[PDB]
Amino acid sequence: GSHMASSRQKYAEEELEQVREALRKAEKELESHSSWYAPEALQKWLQLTHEVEVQYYNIKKQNAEKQLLVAKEGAEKIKKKR
Amino acid sequence: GSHMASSRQKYAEEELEQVREALRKAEKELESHSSWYAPEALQKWLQLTHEVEVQYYNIKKQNAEKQLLVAKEGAEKIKKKR
Structure with a gap:
């Protein structure tokens, strides 16, 4: 049968949130880090991202x-079908 | 002093990788799931993403x-300074 979406929906939600939030979270690091500002380390980090x-x-x-x-x-x- | 980048560089790498790879990972789910295809559940999932x-x-x-x-x-x- 179709390996459909019920339990996998949670993984989808959990990871959707985790993926987007983690990206922004890391930007939050960068600003909280830019409070003191790092050299090329900071530059390279966010530039790559x-x-x-x-x-x-x-x-x-x-x-x-x-x-x-x-x-x-x-x-x-x-x-x-239904 | 500056809370600079040394240990935070690893977190940056680890999260950079985790963020990007998890997003693609989830797309991998969607295709591996589209092998059977779900209804609006699948549609809504990737559409939101x-x-x-x-x-x-x-x-x-x-x-x-x-x-x-x-x-x-x-x-x-x-x-x-150096």
């Missing part, structure tokens, strides 16, 4: 949109 | 750029 998150936003946004595209359609084509 | 990550990319990208802007300049203005 920034170039990575943006690079990844592009790949993941397109991925996500397409992944759900095929899933959304695929699911509502196959799931026609 | 997508709208959130993009909303947040915008806020965090601008934040990060400005946070390091002030930190980069501020730090290299203050840190002129």
Whole structure:
């Protein structure tokens, strides 16, 4: 049968929150750290996070949109029951 | 003194990795889950992740750029010592 979403929904929620919050959390570190300001260490840290998150936003946004595209359609084509 | 980056660098690395990899990890779930395809549960899950990550990319990208802007300049203005 379909390994659907019930228990996995929690993992989805828990990780959704963890992923987004941890990213922002780390930015919170950077500001709380910028209270004293580090050299290239700080610069490199957030710069990597920034170039990575943006690079990844592009790949993941397109991925996500397409992944759900095929899933959304695929699911509502196959799931026609209650 | 400055609460600088040495031990915090590891937390930065560990969390940078955890944040980005967990987001992609969760996409991996979605595809491994789309192998069977869930209804609105799947749709809602990734759609939220997508709208959130993009909303947040915008806020965090601008934040990060400005946070390091002030930190980069501020730090290299203050840190002129070895």
